[PDB]
C-alpha cells in the first residue's frame, strides 16, 4: 500500500518510512529540489491579493511583469518577447502556430512544414506528437498532421558506422539539408529540436552537429527552434541547452521547469527576428500582453530568483556538474554491458548493450532497460529507462554527498544487473 509521505531536497519518503532518491527530479523539472515552503507562501500571497487580472485594464498583472523582467535577465540577448502557457505541450503548439504565422506575415504562406527528428519528443498535443518522432505515436495513423517531417536522430552509437563523432555530426545534420531539398525550401518553416533529446534517452549530439544544423537553417531561410523543455533552467549547467551547444534559435519553448514543477506553466521565448514579424501581424499581441496565470507566474518568479540568486545554476556549471560527470563516468564506465556513458551539467545517461566491441544492442530494445529499471526501483532509486538507455536528471541542488550516495546504489544495482544477466544467459 506504499504511499508517498513527503519530499525534501532530492529525496522522497514513503509510508513504510523508506527514503527514495529521485534521480529524475519528478518529470525532469524539479530543478530546485523538493520542500520549498517559500513557494507555497508566494502562492498563498498571490492567490490572496490578486489571483486574476482582466483585459479590461489594458495593463499586465505585476506578478507577470516581474517574471518577464527577471527572465529577460537570465535569457540570451534578443529574447524580449515571452508568451506564457500552462505547459510544455502548449508551448510547442503555440510555437508551431507562431512559426507558421510568421511566414504568412512575410508573404510566404506556403512555408508551413516543420521538421523534427525520430525519437524526438515535443509533448502530447496533436501538434507536438506529430512533430516528435516517437515511433509509437506515428504508426497511430492520424499523426502526423501535414506540414510535419522527420529526419533521423544524431545517435552515434547506432548510426555512426565507422565515422568519428565529429564526422558523424556533419552527416547527421546534413540529413536536414536532404529533407529540406527533398521537400522544397520554400515549403519549410522551421527545424525544431531538443538540444539533447530527453525522452529519447539523453542522446547527446556530437559537437559538430548543432553549428551545422544552424548553418543549414540559415542557408535555406528556415527558422531554428530549440525545445528547452528538459534542457531549460540550468539542466546542462548553462541556463538553456542551446547555450551549451552554442547555437542561437529564433524561438525556444519552456515548460514546468520554469517553476520547478510546483505549479503548471510554460513559455515561448521569441527572438528579435520573429517577434518583429508577429507584432506586424498582430495575431499574438494579446498573449504577449495578457498571457500568464498570475499565481503560477509568482511561483515561477520565486523559482528563477532561487535558481540565480542562490547560485544554483552557476553551481551546475562550476561545481556539481563537472563532479557528477566525472563521478558518473568513473562509476559506470567499467561495466561489461554498459556503453556510450555520457552527460553534461546534471543530465547524464548510458546505454545497455549486448557487446561493446561490435557496438551491438540487445534485441527488443527496451526489455533489457525494463529489467535494469526494476532493479533501481526495488532498491529505492529513481532513474528512468528509455528503451535500453538509462537516464538521470536529479534536482540541481544535489550535493557531492548525494551524488556519491546515488551512484553507490546505482553501482550495486548494476552489479546485480550483470549477475541476473548471466543467471539468465542473456549476458
Distance of closest approach, residue 25 Cβ to Na ion, in angstroms: 11
Contacting range for Cl ion; rule: CB under 5 A; set: 2-10, 49-57, 129-137, 362-370: 362-370
What are the residues whose beta carbons fall under 8 Å from the beta carbon of 313, sequence distance 6 or more?
Answer: 74, 233, 234, 237, 238, 239, 307, 396
Distance from C-alpha of 328 to C-alpha of 344, rounded to nearest angstrom = 10
118 binds Cl ion (CB under 5 A): no
Using CB under 8 A, list all residues that contact a second copy. Answer: 1-7, 12, 14, 20, 22, 26, 30, 34, 37, 39-41, 43-44, 47-54, 56-59, 61-62, 86-87, 89-90, 93-94, 96-97, 100-101, 104, 109, 112, 124-127, 129, 140-142, 145-147, 261-264, 293, 295-296, 377, 382
227 binds ligand AN7 (CB under 6 A): yes
Q: Within positions 79 to 108, which residues make up the interface with Na ion, using CB under 5 A?
A: 79
Greatest Cα-to-Cα distance within the chain, rounded to the nearest angstrom:
70
Distance from C-alpha of 6 to C-alpha of 20, rounded to nearest angstrom = 11
226 binds ligand AN7 (CB under 6 A): no
Q: Within positions 301 to 360, which residues make up the interface with Na ion, using CB under 5 A?
A: none
From the list Na ion, ligand AN7, a second copy, none, pick the one residue 28 interacts with, judged by a Cβ distance below 5 to 8 Å according to partner type: ligand AN7
256 binds ligand AN7 (CB under 6 A): yes
Distance from C-alpha of 3 to C-alpha of 20, rounded to nearest angstrom = 12
257 binds ligand AN7 (CB under 6 A): no
Binding residue for Na ion, selected from 46, 75, 291, 331, defined by CB under 5 A? 75
Helices then strands, counting H and E runs in the chain, come out as 17, 15
Q: Within positions 269 to 298, which residues make up the interface with ligand AN7, using CB under 6 A?
A: none
Per-residue binding letters, 188-207, with ligand AN7 (x by CB under 6 A): ------x---xx--------
Task: Classify each residue of 176-203 as buried b or exposed e, where b means 16 or more C-beta atoms within 10 Å of its C-beta.
Answer: bbebbeeeeeeebbbbbbbbbbbbbbbb
What is the torsional sign of CA 5, 8, 12, 16?
A: negative
Distance from C-alpha of 258 to C-alpha of 245, rounded to nearest angstrom = 20
Compute, in degrees rounded to 10, the torsion defined by CA atoms 97, 131, 266, 321. Answer: -140
Task: Note the residues at the interface with ligand AN7 (CB under 6 A).
Answer: 27-28, 87-89, 92, 121-124, 194, 198-199, 227, 229-230, 255-256
Amino acid at each position: 500500500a506504499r504511499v508517498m509521505t513527503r519530499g525534501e531536497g532530492v529525496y522522497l519518503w514513503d509510508s513504510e518510512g523508506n527514503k527514495i532518491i529521485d534521480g529524475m527530479a519528478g518529470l525532469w523539472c524539479v530543478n530546485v529540489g523538493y520542500g520549498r515552503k517559500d513557494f507555497a507562501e508566494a502562492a498563498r500571497r498571490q492567490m490572496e491579493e490578486l489571483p486574476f487580472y482582466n483585459t479590461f485594464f489594458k495593463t499586465t498583472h505585476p506578478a507577470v511583469v516581474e517574471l518577464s523582467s527577471l527572465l529577460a535577465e537570465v535569457t540570451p540577448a534578443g529574447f524580449d518577447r515571452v508568451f506564457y502557457t500552462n505547459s510544455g505541450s502548449e508551448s510547442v503548439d503555440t510555437m508551431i502556430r507562431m512559426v507558421r504565422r510568421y511566414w504568412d506575415v512575410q508573404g510566404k504562406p506556403e512555408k508551413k512544414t516543420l521538421i523534427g527528428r525520430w525519437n524526438g519528443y515535443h509533448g502530447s498535443t496533436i501538434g507536438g506528437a506529430s512533430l516528435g518522432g516517437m515511433k509509437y505515436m506515428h504508426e497511430q495513423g492520424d499523426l502526423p498532421i501535414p506540414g510535419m517531417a522527420h529526419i533521423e536522430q544524431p545517435w552515434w552509437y547506432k548510426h555512426g558506422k565507422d565515422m568519428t563523432p565529429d564526422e558523424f555530426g556533419v552527416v547527421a545534420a546534413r540529413w536536414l539539408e536532404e529533407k529540406i531539398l527533398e521537400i522544397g525550401a520554400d515549403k519549410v518553416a522551421a527545424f525544431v529540436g531538443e538540444p539533447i533529446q530527453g525522452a529519447g534517452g539523453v542522446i547527446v549530439p556530437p559537437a559538430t552537429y548543432w553549428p551545422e544544423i544552424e548553418r543549414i537553417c540559415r542557408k535555406y531561410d528556415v527558422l531554428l527552434v530549440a525545445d528547452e523543455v528538459i534542457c531549460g533552467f540550468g539542466r546542462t549547467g548553462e541556463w538553456f541547452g542551446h547555450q551549451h551547444f552554442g547555437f542561437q534559435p529564433d524561438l525556444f519553448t519552456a515548460a514546468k521547469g520554469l517553476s520547478s514543477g510546483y505549479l503548471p506553466i510554460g513559455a515561448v521565448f521569441v527572438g528579435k527576428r520573429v517577434a518583429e514579424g508577429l507584432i506586424a501581424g498582430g495575431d499574438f499581441n494579446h498573449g504577449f500582453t495578457y498571457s500568464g496565470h498570475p499565481v503560477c507566474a509568482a511561483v515561477a518568479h520565486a523559482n528563477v530568483a532561487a535558481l540565480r540568486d542562490e547560485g544554483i545554476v552557476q553551481r551546475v556549471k562550476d561545481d556539481i556538474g563537472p563532479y557528477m560527470q566525472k563521478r558518473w563516468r568513473e562509476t559506470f564506465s567499467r561495466f561489461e554491458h554498459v556503453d556510450d556513458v555520457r552527460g553534461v551539467g546534471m543530465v547524464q545517461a548510458f546505454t545497455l548493450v549486448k557487446n561493446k566491441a561490435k557496438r551491438e544492442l540487445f534485441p527488443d530494445f527496451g526489455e533489457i532497460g525494463t529489467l535494469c529499471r526494476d532493479i533501481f526501483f526495488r532498491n529505492n532509486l529513481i532513474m528512468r529507462a528509455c528503451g535500453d538507455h538509462i537516464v538521470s536528471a536529479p534536482p540541481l541542488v544535489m550535493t557531492r554527498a548525494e551524488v556519491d550516495e546515488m551512484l553507490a546504489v546505482a553501482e550495486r544495482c548494476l552489479e546485480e544487473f550483470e549477475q541476473t544477466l548471466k543467471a539468465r544467459g542473456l549476458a
